[PDB]
Write a protein that binds this DNA or RNA. Structure first.
Ligand code: MG
Ligand code: MG
Lengths: 251, 308, 245, 101
RNA sequence: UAUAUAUAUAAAUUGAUUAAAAAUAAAAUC
């Protein structure tokens, strides 16, 4: 058996009662408004748990199963606030023990359904600068630093490249106040990593010649475009690549 | 590609690769994918529906089938091999941008690439279907990333109305403080949990009528001056950048803020390096996805046989 | 100690400085007398071999004191993770062959034509000591791996190289010698893998690919360590070395 | 009933079984290889804990008989390598298949 | 350097009287 199942919230919510004929509302919209909470004149939803980003280096990921759909807290005191029959937000009768007892792994789990998905730790700027100094200045290999800091070699090389690019951008004053704010904010939203031959002929060039020929040695029977090769231009297996300029070319 | 149509419908409840408020609610209320009481074909169809709604929705079905790779890569807990069903889409440039938190959604990443705001190893790339190889460096224009991650820039009229309300509320607070400073100080300290000059320091603010002030931005900029908001209209400190100018994060950013395992990101420069293709290891899969392993298993079974 | 002393009947382990001086005197007499009789250095060395072999049997039980029992005795602290006791036991109950032969040459030069009494005391102390065979060297290498002591590993590889020159090693067959050398090389590879010096381990593996057959069992730890850091080039090189077959 | 499972994911070897007119040919599979079998066999493997399998059903395709034959084949048409080694008086290394490149 | 702003009135397309929706779909804004 299978049928269309409108994705109503799995948790309890306040369904529509008798409606004035012109409301033209839906239970889904009411559930969305209950999850969102009241909206400000500025357009914000301060009541919601997740409206504002975290700053304690611990992510704030949705936990609909643990909180049973109650996603409204006081913006300042950060204490739970449930809808009441009078229509106001107020303290809950009994506080959910599940929300105090949260496993450390689940805090790094972005999506409630998938446990295997987890966020990655963000390296501190000091560690990146230390890696830059260790590699470029002290001449250490990527293997030794990767073993030293519990890191992987491709990540070490990427860190080297990124720190070099950051140094260049800081040289040109390209990093701006807004960019600094954005970097700082996204830094505090994530957990922080803890350290502990073929012959070649280059041709003669003459004035006025716009190009120079390059001749590569090759072996007969292996060099050339084959005769009768399959044509995939009109097939779903058509082969596409990108030029050195970056344009798209059929291969 | 497909035309974006009802990507955030609450009734259908599909989850998309996006930071939408409606997408957030759809993800929040979903719970899990219900596979009980369904035949094998129905289970496979539901799994395909959900996973393709999230993974590569903008791709056409036949194009995804051609791009689909029946093989999977991996490198004590059980390794989730079949979460790698959609790992092939992760090397695409737009997907890399989205996973690097340089775009609010894969569609916005596609638009950023198509409009010439993205570079890969220093050469401009204008094709979202471009595929990255390990070690490839890509970067985005900083203004585009700030717009994608920053809050929306208000218009002059809306921000003027917000400033009217702000001036009004400041005047109300000033009146309350001046009339009864005792209870105001008591409330302030209680919320945190005397000198009469404090209430003298507070100053009223001239109420503003927008009918005469409309159409002239510098006049309003000079007239509006609040202790936090000095000499600019709400959200328009410098009305020439494409975002809410006093830069604050877009709303509902924390639910989707996920740091990838296969990309290394430098947000100061809006640069990133594609370390590797996502792989599956014991107890973890580097393919970010909101669906559990059985859903990907059923989608893989569907796409092995083309829905046969 | 109770077993060494045959239940206390032999007072070999109990020692005194008076006994030390008197034994040094007696053995100086015996050896500096012996120095002249022998036809050549080889014959004097043979006399010293017989002397030490008979002395050790006279002083300590032959059956109880041997390679196997000493191996277990020294293996105790390694499992118990006590380096000081292991080193004390190793020094006290084991003698290195090359040092002994060097002492024989030195005493030959001294007699035929404070250090002298030290050499005499060495020859006297041989009654408490067993020659360090290849298995005991491998055991000390295992102790180096367990304790993560670079100094011990360096000293052990020096002593192993010197022991290779000594006659007891060359007495054995070529195949046994190759097997023991391969075991030592694998132990060194494991040591460098634990120390994190993967470059040194791959260097050892590559340098001796032809003379030693490298299997995946020996390099499994190295492969795991290299995969954990994702050094695909080194992994490919090592796998090519092992699996070229 | 408990069923033998090789590496907790698949059957130990190829199984050719006969049940009341249903011929089951079930082949083991590599890690990551999904369940590619009759839907009844797919559900039975899902409940049993078998993750990797291939197979084909010949002659009768009755769902009830397929299910009973699948259970009985898992129970009698299967033997652990430990059992084989102990019965033949050999070590597990002697009965493991050697790799050929 | 305040900030869960709160009150009013007015309206509110198709279906329906609540798990019956169309529908964030429109408009509008950037
Ligand atoms: Mg149907
Ligand atoms: Mg009507």
């Amino acid at each position: 058996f299978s049928r269309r199942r409108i994705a109503y919230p799995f948790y309890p919510f306040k369904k529509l009662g008798r409606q004035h004929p012109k409301k033209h509302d839906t239970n889904l919209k009411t559930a969305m408004r209950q999850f969102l909470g009241p909206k400000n004149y500025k357009g914000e939803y301060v009541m919601n748990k997740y409206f504002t980003v975290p700053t304690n280096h611990v992510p704030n990921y949705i936990k609909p199963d643990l909180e049973r759909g109650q996603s409204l807290e006081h913006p300042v005191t950060k204490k739970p606030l449930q809808l009441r029959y009078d229509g106001t937000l107020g303290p809950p009768p009994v506080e959910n023990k599940r929300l105090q007892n949260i496993f450390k792994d689940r805090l790094l789990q972005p999506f409630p359904s998938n446990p295997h998905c987890k966020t990655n730790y963000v390296l501190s700027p000091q560690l990146k600068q230390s890696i830059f100094e260790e590699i470029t200045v002290e001449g250490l290999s990527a293997q030794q630093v990767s073993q030293k800091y519990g890191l992987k070699i491709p990540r070490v090389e990427a860190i080297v490249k990124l720190v070099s690019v950051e140094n260049s951008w800081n040289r040109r004053n390209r990093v701006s106040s807004d960019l600094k704010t954005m970097d700082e904010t996204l830094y505090r939203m994530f957990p922080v990593f803890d350290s502990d031959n073929t012959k070649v002929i280059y041709g003669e060039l003459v004035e006025g010649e716009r190009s120079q020929y390059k001749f590569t040695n090759a072996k007969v029977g292996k060099v050339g475009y084959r005769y009768g090769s399959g044509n995939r231009d009109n097939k779903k297996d058509r082969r596409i690549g990108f030029n050195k300029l970056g344009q798209m070319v059929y291969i | 590609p497909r035309k974006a149509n009802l990507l955030k419908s609450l009734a259908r409840g599909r989850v998309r690769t996006s930071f939408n408020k409606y997408n957030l609610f759809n993800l929040y209320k979903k719970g899990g994918v219900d596979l009980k009481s369904k035949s094998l074909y129905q289970q496979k169809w539901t799994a395909k529906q959900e996973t393709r709604a999230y993974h590569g929705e903008h791709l056409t079905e036949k194009r995804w089938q051609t791009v689909f790779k029946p093989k999977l890569d991996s490198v004590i807990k059980e390794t989730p091999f079949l979460l790698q069903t959609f790992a092939v889409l992760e090397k695409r440039l737009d997907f890399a941008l989205f996973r690097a938190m340089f775009a609010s959604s894969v569609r916005q990443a596609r638009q950023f690439i198509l409009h010439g705001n993205v570079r890969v190893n220093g050469v401009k790339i204008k094709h979202p279907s471009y595929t990255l190889k390990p070690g490839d460096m890509f970067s985005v224009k900083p203004d585009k990333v700030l717009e994608a991650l920053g809050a929306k820039k208000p218009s002059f009229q809306e921000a003027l109305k917000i400033d009217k309300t702000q001036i009004v509320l400041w005047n109300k607070y000033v009146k309350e403080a001046k009339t009864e400073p005792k209870e105001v100080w008591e409330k302030k300290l209680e919320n945190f949990e005397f000198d009469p000059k404090w209430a003298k320091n507070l100053k009223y603010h001239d109420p503003i009528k927008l009918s005469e002030l409309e159409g002239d931005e510098p006049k309003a900029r000079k007239l509006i001056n609040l202790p936090w908001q000095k000499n600019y209209v709400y959200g328009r400190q410098d009305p020439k950048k494409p975002f809410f100018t006093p830069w604050k994060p877009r709303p509902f950013l924390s639910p989707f803020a996920i740091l990838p395992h296969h990309l290394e990101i430098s947000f100061k420069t809006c640069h990133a390096v594609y370390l590797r293709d996502p792989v599956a290891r014991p107890g973890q899969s580097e393919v970010i996805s909101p669906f559990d392993v059985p859903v990907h298993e059923r989608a893989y079974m569907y796409y092995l046989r083309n829905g046969k | 100690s109770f077993n060494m002393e045959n239940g206390g009947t032999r007072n070999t382990l109990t020692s005194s400085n008076e006994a030390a001086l008197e034994d040094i005197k007696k053995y100086r007499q015996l050896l500096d007398s012996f120095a002249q009789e022998a036809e050549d250095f080889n014959e004097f060395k043979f006399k010293v071999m017989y002397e030490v072999t008979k002395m050790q049997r006279e002083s300590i039980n032959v059956n109880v004191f041997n390679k196997i029992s000493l191996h277990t005795y020294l293996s105790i602290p390694i499992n118990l993770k006590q380096q000081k006791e292991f080193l004390r036991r190793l020094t006290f109950f084991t003698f290195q062959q090359h040092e002994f032969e060097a002492v024989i040459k030195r005493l030959y030069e001294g007699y035929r034509n404070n250090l002298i009494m030290h050499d005499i005391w060495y020859i006297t102390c041989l009654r408490h000591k067993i020659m360090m065979d290849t298995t005991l060297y491998e055991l000390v290498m295992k102790a180096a791996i367990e304790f993560q002591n670079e100094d011990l590993a360096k000293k052990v590889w020096n002593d192993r190289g010197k022991f290779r020159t000594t006659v007891p090693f060359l007495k054995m067959d070529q195949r046994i010698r190759i097997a023991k050398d391969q075991k030592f090389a694998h132990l060194m590879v494991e040591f460098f893998t634990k120390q994190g010096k993967y470059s040194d381990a791959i260097a050892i593996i590559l340098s001796s690919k032809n003379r030693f057959n490298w299997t995946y069992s020996m390099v499994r730890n190295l492969h795991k360590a290299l995969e954990e850091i994702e050094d695909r080039n080194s992994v490919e090189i090592l796998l090519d070395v092992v699996n070229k077959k | 009933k408990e069923i033998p499972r090789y590496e907790n994911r698949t059957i130990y070897g190829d199984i050719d079984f006969r049940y009341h007119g249903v011929k089951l040919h079930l082949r083991s599979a590599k890690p990551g290889f999904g369940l590619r079998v009759n839907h009844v066999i797919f559900e039975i493997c899902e409940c049993a804990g078998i993750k990797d399998l291939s197979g084909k059903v010949y002659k009768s395709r009755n769902d009830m008989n397929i299910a009973k034959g699948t259970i009985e084949a898992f129970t009698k048409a299967q033997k652990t390598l430990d059992e084989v080694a102990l019965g033949r008086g050999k070590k597990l290394v002697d009965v493991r298949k050697v790799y050929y490149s």
